[PDB]
Amino acid sequence: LGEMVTVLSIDGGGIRGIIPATILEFLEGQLQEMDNNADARLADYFDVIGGTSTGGLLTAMISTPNENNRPFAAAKEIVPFYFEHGPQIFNPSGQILGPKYDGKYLMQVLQEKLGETRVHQALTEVVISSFDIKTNKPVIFTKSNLANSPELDAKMYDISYSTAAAPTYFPPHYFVTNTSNGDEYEFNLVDGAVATVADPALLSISVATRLAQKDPAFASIRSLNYKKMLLLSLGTGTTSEFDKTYTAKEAATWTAVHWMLVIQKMTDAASSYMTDYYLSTAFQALDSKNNYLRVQENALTGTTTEMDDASEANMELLVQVGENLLKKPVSEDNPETYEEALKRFAKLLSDRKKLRA
């Protein structure tokens, strides 16, 4: 168990980020109780912490060092963050030409809570996604892969704004770093969901697998041995309820405007289903299905669907969805609930740390 690699992955979902945050508040509290340490943080138990958009914001806030070289935010401080800053991040600009939001508040609160910290300072391996619209390539921010190409040692707020810079919602982000030669290196980044990874769990598994080639602490998964891998992937919920879906017939006359307000939700939903299929296939092939815990909501209803509904009523509903998810079964045939599976996971995390110490 001591040689096992631990990976945490958080999906994007806008305001639906309350759901994995509620899930992480429960898990961090389990670890704090078991280890008799109220200062116990997720970055102390996870080797890799991956996140896209709001999952990336979360990743950055629990990986960035504070004044004590401790993770900046506790898991229980994330739903209050979403409740406090969510209505101001998701406050419409009112402008006719451009995105729904100016991104001014989102950047300001990120700057405020992340400071001048760089990715090389992360307390664990981070995997925060984006897509560069100038190089037309995904740009994945890691603590590793910095030895080669130091121009990726970007500010945590530039990484965090970029991962969440959703086309039509917020404007793309432009920022500069410096290469080894001292010359400028340009970034023109949009949301990580564009880079096809709304669900960054497979990307996070690949980063760990690639690190296993150059790091002895990751050596146990060196030849795809996911038997020696613990993966916690967290979703922001999907929906199949006919009230919130569409027919091919009604969509026959849909213009470019209607599609744009709906494709991100579709690709993000598809990203969840495909990445889960890839990972289940791989873990079930090695007879290690329980090494991969995917905490996801499949029946979002009402306002709970929308990514930018930062009203008090929708935020309270998202908490309720998160708290009901804990009592919901892991599978259709498995009676084991998520709260129970998360206790088993916390125990494994707790036991691996002790042995490594």
Numbering used by the authors: 25 to 381
Copy text verbatim from the article accompanying this structure deposition.
Currently, little is known about the inhibitory potential of OP compounds such as DFP and MAFP toward patatin, beyond the fact that DFP inhibits the insecticidal ability of patatin. Consistent with this observation, we found DFP is capable of inhibiting pat17 with a 20-min IC50 of 182.1±11.1 µM. The 2.6 Å structure of pat17 co-crystallized with DFP showed an aged adduct consisting of a serine-bound DFP moiety lacking an isopropyl chain, indicating that aging had taken place. The DFP-aged structure contains a negatively charged dealkylated oxygen. This negatively charged oxygen was within hydrogen-bonding distance to the oxyanion hole (being located 2.6 Å, 2.7 Å and 3.4 Å from amide nitrogen atoms of Gly37, Gly38 and Thr78, respectively) and 5.1 Å from the Oδ2 of Asp215, which together with Ser77 comprises the catalytic dyad of patatin. Furthermore, the phosphoryl oxygen of DFP was located within hydrogen-bonding distance (2.8 Å) from the Oδ2 of Asp215. Crystals of the DFP-pat17 complex were grown in a solution with a final pH of 5.4 (measured at 4°C). Consequently, based on our structure, we propose that hydrogen bonding between this negatively charged oxygen and the protonated amide nitrogens of Gly37 and Gly38 help stabilize the negatively charged OP moiety within the active site chamber of pat17. This is expected to be similar to how the oxyanion hole helps stabilize the negatively charged tetrahedral intermediate of a native substrate during catalysis. Taken together, these observations suggest that the protonated amides in the oxyanion hole of pat17 may play a role in the aging reaction by stabilizing the emerging net negative charge on the alkoxy oxygen during the dealkylation phase of the aging process.
Patatin is a soluble 40 kDa non-specific plant lipase that is expressed extensively in the tubers of potatoes and other members of the nightshade family. Previously, the crystal structure of a recombinant patatin isoform, patatin-17 (pat17), derived from the tubers of heartleaf nightshade (Solanum cardiophyllum), has shown this protein to have a modified α/β hydrolase fold containing a central 6-stranded β-sheet sandwiched by 9 α-helices along with a catalytic center composed of a Ser77-Asp215 dyad. This fold and active site configuration is reminiscent of the human cytosolic phospholipase A2 family of enzymes, but it is distinct from the traditional Ser-His-Asp/Glu catalytic triads found in serine proteases and esterases such as chymotrypsin and acetylcholinesterase (AChE), respectively. Recently, interest in patatin and its homologues has been heightened by the discovery that a diverse group of mammalian lipases, termed the patatin-like phospholipase domain containing proteins (PNPLAs), encompass catalytic domains with sequence similarity to patatin.
